[PDB]
Paper text:
Two well-diffracting crystal forms of the RsiGRr protein were obtained. The structure of the second RsiGRr crystal form was solved by molecular replacement (MR) and refined to Rwork/Rfree values of 19.9%/26.8% to 2.55-Å resolution. The same antiparallel homodimer found in crystal form 1 was evident in this structure. The same RsiGRr crystal forms were obtained in the presence of c-di-GMP under identical crystallization conditions, but no nucleotide was visible in the structures. This appears to be due to the presence of Mg2+ ions, which were required for crystallization for both crystal forms. The Mg2+ ions in both apo structures are coordinated by D74, located at the C terminus of the E(X)3S(X)2R(X)3Q(X)3D motif. The tightly coordinated Mg2+ in the RsiGRr structure sterically disallows c-di-GMP binding. The presence of the same homodimers in both RsiGRr apo crystal structures, though they were obtained under very different conditions, supports that single-motif containing proteins can form the same antiparallel coiled-coil homodimer as observed in the monomeric twin-motif RsiGSv. Importantly, the finding also indicates that c-di-GMP binding is not necessary for dimerization of single-motif RsiG proteins. Interestingly, the regions that extend N and C terminal to the homodimeric RsiGRr central coiled-coils adopt short helical structures, which appear to depend on the crystal packing environment.
The RsiG–WhiG cognate pair is the only known example of a σ–anti-σ complex that is targeted by c-di-GMP. Here we show that the same σ–(c-di-GMP)–anti-σ switch has been co-opted during evolution to regulate distinct biological functions in unicellular and filamentous bacteria, controlling type IV pilus production in the genus Rubrobacter and the differentiation of reproductive hyphae into spores in Streptomyces. Moreover, we show that the anti-σ likely originated as a homodimer and evolved to become a monomer through an intragenic duplication event. Structural analyses revealed that these single-motif RsiGs form an antiparallel coiled-coil through homodimerization, enabling them to bind c-di-GMP in the same manner as the monomeric twin-motif RsiGs.
Residue numbers in the entry:
A (entry chain A), B (entry chain B): 28 to 98
Amino acid sequence: ESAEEVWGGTEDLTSLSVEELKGLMARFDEEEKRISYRRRVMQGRIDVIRAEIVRRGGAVLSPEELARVLM
Amino acid sequence: ESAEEVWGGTEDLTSLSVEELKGLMARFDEEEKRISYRRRVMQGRIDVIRAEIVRRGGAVLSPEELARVLM
Ligand SMILES: [Mg+2]
Ligand SMILES: [Mg+2]
């Protein structure tokens, strides 16, 4: 019923009607956008945090640890 | 106790210890990675559906409706 279920319960792409594919695309395009928003929020948080740590002198964290988020 | 709450509840960035800074960066970084993976999955699906629709033709949709996902 949900896009996920329909998509998942399909073994053959060609069995899907155009109405289905249209509906699925819109659904996934919608989600993709909601997911990207979430990514950007995470990136912002990571961003603010890395600047705060750098502001304090980097602690004793090497530049590469800061850039790779190894901790 | 969850990162979501410690972070949502912080008024002043400078009030956060360095220990908790590192914890939050670590949590959000991994979250960022998981979210990016889903994005990529969605894009993979939109890609598969868009190819399928193109393959069939039928002028069901105009090039700009396929491209902007205007159903
Ligand atoms: Mg920055
Ligand atoms: Mg393709």
